[model samples]
Target: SEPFSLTEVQTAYMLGRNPQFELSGISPQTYFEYETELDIARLSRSFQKVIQRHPMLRAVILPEGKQQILRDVPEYEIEVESLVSMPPEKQAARLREERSRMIDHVFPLGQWPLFELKAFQLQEHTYLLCFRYDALLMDGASMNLVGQDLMHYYHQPDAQLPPLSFTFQDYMHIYDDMKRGTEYETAKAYWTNKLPDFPPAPSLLLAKDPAEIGTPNFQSLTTIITKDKWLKLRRLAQDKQVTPSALLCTVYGEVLAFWSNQRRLAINLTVFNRYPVHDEVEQIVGDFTSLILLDMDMDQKQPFFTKVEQTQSTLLDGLEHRHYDGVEFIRDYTRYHQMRPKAVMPIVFTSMLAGAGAFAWEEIGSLRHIHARTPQVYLDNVVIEKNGELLVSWNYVEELFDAEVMESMFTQFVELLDQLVEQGDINPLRIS
Candidate 1:
């Protein structure tokens, strides 16, 4: 429950990008005939413990009234369900309907979707962990906490942690208090000036899939590069004096500008948003997290390196303004500009090429043997090996981009990864 109080870092680097969000809780695989140890009842207790252990989980959102007070759950029980096996498309439709239903009843009118619990039987042997959550409340780090806590309890129930020193409610208070203080006002003013005078048009790069409407489905695919190639890419990035992330935007903007046949492309990006700390939870367990943007004019035909340098400048500025909600900024921007969609395109290029040389975990025996499980409903490809060999796959809706465009985006993403691994010595676009 206290984990929710911690600012949810929008670090899609691993957390947002992972399927762990789809996982409601542990599911005992029938394939494991050995013990059949974790049945639904025990699993339910573990789930309750989960909601109890993490104050964030117990958060019953009250969006409109003085923000949501992170309160304890009135009931700590599991909701169960039974359903015939349905195709992925049908399952998605089911979830979509539930999401629509959730809009009104789930507290705030636009209250971000609160985390939901769902389970269904696929047959006697298998089960489905249907779930969704308001990304605003929790991020990847929070999910990791939930997954680890649930998994640990499933295996070691006897061990108990102390009652939470703080609760998610406290965290909410901390955020409300923090946001009201002078620093927030100072930060708010800084951002007010940082954004464009007129909110620019939502960038429409050639969609990875042009015909798609709504959130395009995505699956992960990873590309590995030799250390040498990685280093060369890094060196080249420094030559232009750009972070690997900016280099990705530069090349992606160019290629996508070509693809979309547009001069300017607006982009959305997530940041750790942890102001005073790097990855520590306590440093930012409140509302210091954020996502930001980059609106690039792709027609600038300076050397590709120059475009990357520009990206570096914009990204640095983004970090400076990365405190408050992007959703809020866009809401205001749309109202002010009278824009139609009111939001920018979701397409993005993230260079999460954190190469630690080898896969961290020694074994992944099966679904049962896996560690840090995240429930993803519509994953198609990709795997996460926890930095070393932890590769998180992101499969986008196939309808969004044709094979060639998808191939190019995928290939360029890997090239960017290699560049990131090497610290910017190589150029993926040149070879691509």
Candidate 2:
């Protein structure tokens, strides 16, 4: 029963008991409808083997703020159910019920197996892989890794899985080293100097339910850019020698400025710390991403490309000094000032560029429809590409902000993006 301290990101979620963020666990699922029946026994063995290899899968937290990776655990298997004889409506209802049960299942100290998996037979040859897990266990990259590895293990049970470049313990050691070393000191100094006027209290100007900050109610709206418009955006990014992320962050800053009528703005930027220095954390499971600060000056007179380049520069600088963990940063800051629990990084933004062929559609004996049950991230804006077109999702807590305001914010962003790409305009006031 040896124990290890939680990493900074882990500690962040562990900080307060606000159910809004605590129960904000993610339940993402992928459905696979096979042309042939799946072998339940073989799949079960593969799942067990995969679970035995990853220590985190069998970890449990302790009241002393440490997580213990246990050995000699109970047998692991994917839950399989038969619904072939049930009516289609009942099967659907059962699946929804399972989802709700999974979401409501709180993982407390001493709770091992932080995730669940199930397969249902909706049709003669169809199956659904319902996965529910806490964000404390892994991030998006880790989820993708687990899915890919599960498939690999299911197919080649006896094959040796490649050794991880670094384990979770190694990552914690890295975090410790950074925190006690010169780099951490310098990074902290830079942040302190940069954010001289950082707000000590939460900003509720955009909040819809400011009175009840603990409310977990959230609503999301998604919009997709057509392929042709996506092409234009890519062209503009290429012409300006900037990344799509830069364009996205710049657009978000502009829209926020227009909404708030501010000359300078502070927003949360999600940084995935998969640097080569970290030994290919990108391919591993666990949360390696942290939300950092993105401060921007939105000058209406600046050209679109100029703004993009500036954004690119700022993003690179932030990444370079992003060793500081956001969770720990807030923790230390609040402790030093004796401040109450509050929303530190309220408005978060991030983007994922899916270059054509980013994901090879998986097939198991036959092609199946793959749909996602996305998780909630309140007060966050995520930009991703679908079929090479820009896809944006605005996830916000219902009580914190009005749905209409959120809708208008997204609309202004899209319209500004279109103008910036098609007409090369960066005027903050210009929106079509």
Candidate 3:
């Protein structure tokens, strides 16, 4: 089928954010993966053709979807802002100069930055292009698609392609219809049952100040569970006849309870709803991401493993009822939650269960990524892969969290996963 196009709303959202990272790239990979070489001219051509194929990308948005809406993908110029190989200090200066001009030119639209181009000369012929984008119309799911489409444009231009299956315009109709009834209410009830009220589940180790919500800097440690631990996690989940995610989550809940030294816990998780390969589910170009919530009030003395079991059962029950729109939920409930009083957690975990089939990579050894990490508060995603797991770089507004704290939390999580794997069949609730 033909790949889908981004809608007006989708485009606005996609291009309106940047991954706030100390470095241009976001995610743990910022620290782990090395940059790939890029050809600025070729990449720019790909971007233009990309817009031609998907008109939504060409949209020139006006002040948050209000005022005169310019619904055309303009032939925006691709300005190659760069410099020659030079000293470390000079290189930094050149990079900043180009990026600054590019930002001024493109980022103002709140649309996908069309002029974003950065050069990191690693070798005589090898260089890396640091890129950025707005998140409204872009997400990890759709990034994969963008990568694929770009590659197809570059490599398989004449190959046989699939017939058009579904699209963002088509999805708008369905999403709009979904807003019409008990569907949202049913989703609300499901999450309400799953989330605990009172204290939030994410117990940030701070001097319990409700006022400190605006800060986005926090220490982040990102890594996947080791292979052995992942297997044990799988075994435990299989033992209970549940998906590995359910098991991973239950164990995570027990750990949260143990750390808080309290009972009630509300942890937000995400779901793609696309992993099940349902002949029934349709793939749309806009955001299909949503939170998978869980709420539990444990007995003060309930062992973590027992709590794990309880959580597992709860997740099994809640899985089918998790589908709904968070945008609507926020619109409906913002006043009650005091949306103005405090900002929500700047960080959320998103695993691209499926790729956004909009674009692709073919030029630079299949380099594929998107405007995933936003400069403001944003979400880091983990995608399940044939390998152990692909972890997203944790990006946050540096002012909000201590990088050290994030480092420790991530380290501890991996360690705990390992420990649980080593002592399988042992009760998850066994407390010292």
Candidate 4:
């Protein structure tokens, strides 16, 4: 088969392969711990089945910034380690160490098996199954599909997965054709018109020296909105006639506006762009994510509810023209300003509030999700719903930001959410 061109998001990851870019070593991972006497051999066999079904899992990136699906590759086996000998505390600590090691690892671009699977025996019947894959292989939604399929095959080895009506290659062909269409031109025109006035990336106080920057030493500060608060917030969003995402995003942008002291700010928003061209688009395991630049102009005179409405409108407008990749927009901005191809809109807000898919991992085990890190991102704010609660995490580069600043910002973010829930239409600027 001929080499396929990568999607804009995939191309960005491929560009990170340059060592001078200091953006190469990013791996996103997730794991599940459950009580089951799962045979290691059986689990490995199930994984093999999944790999065979998903072509991207076995695909490799070519040096020319294209991807090629291999007809066959080397047999992959899951790495199993027994932690039953150690105490529970030690087991937990060791697991953290293993996870960190994988997160820091940089998978070779031009090689097969761009992912790793490990099984840890935590107790006589309990085991933790970890899956770590190169970001180039798939996105969060894709990973969920892999997990669902893996469990399905484990339960019944003879069971056949539903035939995929669409494949990654098919998507690529559609994407290429899109570039030549009028819709593409219209989207390009929209971004091109807006690119000239796009503001600089949101700024934060830097703790690192000039020499200390560039290398990614990722860290996170997370806080949870309990079930009660989450429910109330959702109710407030409904009452205000705005989506939960728009409300959350409005508050998030408020925090940034307060910190950066910028009336106008730009955020790189991650959108799951699985086009509805194919009936089985959602079922395919691939990076269908596209980044779009979101511009927010917060007016201090405007009430919080008004800002939320404006945010919802802006977000809808951006999504309509999302075919113009945010990465390409940044590239154009860099060229126009004659700046380095570093981080633009380093502050991102991603909401997976509705959850990735209907996988139902709880049936097999308790799931623990780890956030992904990318090169050049100073701070990434992620929101996800978990077990009737909301988890808001601020994943940032530890070296680039002070601990106290991050903590304070996170505290204020939560506090603002509470304020919004309690007081319907207050000026966000007055909260602090």
Candidate 5:
């Protein structure tokens, strides 16, 4: 029997195991509509095969002190439901109900499989395919991979499916081996040098009443940047030789720095560790996600382009070393419970740049069209569809800040970004 050591990213998610530091469980789901009817029996058989093929789909966690091990377990069950011949409003309501349930549901790691399959025949010809899995089982990438694979099996269950060339255990082995080498040492030094200057956590601290508050009731304020503005953003990115991600980070960090009156800011950013160097870890249906701290100094004296340049450098370096486990790092240096219940990660920022695959209208095997509804907002964070065109969302806990406060902050982000785009080479302080 082979043993799979958990990757650093997996450990960060595992810390949420205990109630004190639970990461907001998220449900990443996809809905498919076939203008033609689906064979329910065939789909079920295909789904069973899909689980057998991807071990991570049915792997259960064995909790050890801080690191958890994932072991493959066969004979897992996936739930399938049908809601046919319903009126339009009723179908919409059912969709909402199911989505909400999935987002709130969490499976006990070792008790059962981490992932589950669900389908709803929304109409005589339309079917909605959804998966409610632990964050441990998914990153944004896995959602797409799982949805596409499910359909592929459903479409051609006996189409000579690809044999398993690599398993999650192999990935775990490779990642751990890297840590024993020089690259790991360099990343360690990088964080040790850079992170010491930062406070244990940064604060938005916007509440009028500074008294302690109870559990947060999460909510959000979503906004957008029109195509015209989005184009300006891209043009600016091209003109400056930085990515839209860098530009977004700069604006977010700058605004938060001003808000907190600090020159140095640390914003939580994510790494989809599909490292270009690794090819053997291809297409594994498990979490390859890790968190990185994007640090920027918002010194208004420097022209904004230089700020962006600094951001570009930092982002590149951060991604290179993103394999470092944030959970392990925290346990080694600080109390694991420091961020209890805040949900903000002690800062006002985290970001996801979900690319064009989000808008992918690509065909699924013999299906008319495919659409994945927007991923449910289960965290207090920002998400953008960075397809040159912009759809920026700011999901937050209203209990933490007033609605108007969150809205005003979002407006500031949009304005700052717009101004920076307009004056690509100048100090953003002069924007107004």
Candidate 6:
């Protein structure tokens, strides 16, 4: 089969690769701890079935910036460890250590299996199943879909799964065709015009040069909004006539601006770029995600509601012209200015709020979602709604910045949210 052009997001990830980084395999991972008696043999067979169904799992990127889906891949078996003999009191720590070791395992690129699965038995009937995959093969949404399929196959191995409307390769072909159309040209022109005056990424305080930082030890500080407050924030969003994402983005921009002392901010938003070319596009396991750079100007002294409206407008405009993604835009920017390709916008905002309804793990067991790490990313603000509440997490490198600074920034971010929920339209910049 002929090779296809790498998607902009894939290109960006490939560009950011550092072979010396020991934790390069640390991408997105999710695990479920179950109290039921899970059959390891059945689970292994089920996983193999799922892997065979999704060709992207068997895909690899070439050296010259192209992707190829391999038709044949070696059969996979899930790795298992028995901790039943160990003391019950020490079992939990052993599980944590195993997870940490897996997170630090480096999966080389261009390999057939770009993912891994492991199972640990803490007791006779208790098992912890961990799944980790490279972002180049799939996105967060794909993780959910793959998990559902794994469980489905585990229960009914002989049952016929629904046929996919199209494959990821077909979607790639559709993307290639779009690139030759007028819509692509129009979007390219729109972003090209804005490229000249676009500011650099928000200047957050840093402790060390990004080039010198390797094998990042990622940590997170999370704040949860109870259902009541979350509902109030939703009502406020409705009253302001903006989506929840826009509201959150506006507040995030304000917080960054206040901390960086910069009126203009460049934030990289992770967009689930699944085109509606196929009926079962959502079910396909692939990396259909892209980045959109938000050029927000927070210099205006406007009410919070007005700012959200403006932010929503900008978001809509960016989506309209999203064909030229942040990765491509940054590539052009760096090339035009003769700058090295790096994390042009180290701060990212990713919202998985929409997936709250579809995310399910009861069939396998209770879910424990883990933080994803990426090279050159200083801070990643992730917003997700779980169990009728909002979880806003700040995932950052532990050694990249002072803990005090990050704590202060997160404190202000939470306080800002509280003020917005109580007072619908206040000055966002006035955090105190």
lDDT by residue (1-432, candidate 4, tens digit) is 578999888877776655465433453332223444677788789889999998888799888889988889888897778988998899889988887777777777678877887788887677887766777888767877887898899899999998887789889999988878888889889988887888777676677642346567677776778888888888888998999988988788878888887888887777675778788988888888778778787645777788789889988888888777788788888888787645656788877665322544445566565556776678888876766778787888887778888888888888888877787644435433
TM-score rank order: 4, 6, 2, 5, 3, 1
Off by over 4 Å in 1: 1-44, 63-131, 178-182, 185-189, 192-244, 247-251, 262-264, 275-289, 295-309, 335-341, 345-385, 389-408, 415-432
User: What is the per-residue lDDT of model 6 for residues 195-253, given as tens digits with 9 covering 90 to 100?
Assistant: 88887778987898766666577777877888898888888788778899999888888
Q: Cα lDDT for residue 116, model 4? A: 80
- lDDT comparing candidate 3 with the true structure: 0.46
lDDT by residue (tens digit), candidate 2, 1-432: 467767766665554333454323333222223333566567778778777667667777666767777867899776778788998799879977775555446566577777776677767666665566665666655655665676777778779787766667666667676678788777777776665555432243555444355435445566778888888888878888998888888888777776676766667776555646575556556667666677677755777678778879877877766766655555555666565544555677855565552322132343222222223234677765654666677767666677777787888888887787668665446543
| Span of ten consecutive residues with least summed lDDT in model 6 | 23-32
| Ranked candidates, highest lDDT first | 6, 4, 2, 5, 1, 3
Evaluate model 6: give its lDDT: 0.77
Deviation of model 5 at 145, angstroms: 2.3
Give TM per candidate.
0.59, 0.80, 0.68, 0.90, 0.75, 0.88
Tens-place lDDT per residue, model 1, 130-168, is: 344544455434544565666667667788855556544
**Candidate 3 lDDT by residue in tens digits, 176-256:** 555556866787676555333533545555433434433233233344444455556667657756655554555455555
- Model 6 misplacement above 4 A: 1-3, 19-43, 155-158, 425-432
Clashes of each: 54, 4, 64, 0, 0, 0
- lDDT score at residue 36, model 5, on the 0-100 scale: 31
- Candidate 5 runs further than 4 Å off: 1-3, 21-49, 65-97, 127-129, 154-158, 199-201, 206-217, 220-232, 276-278, 329-344, 348-391, 414-432
> lDDT per residue, candidate 5, 147-199, as tens digits?
56767887787786667687666666777787788887887777777655644
lDDT of 6 at 148: 81
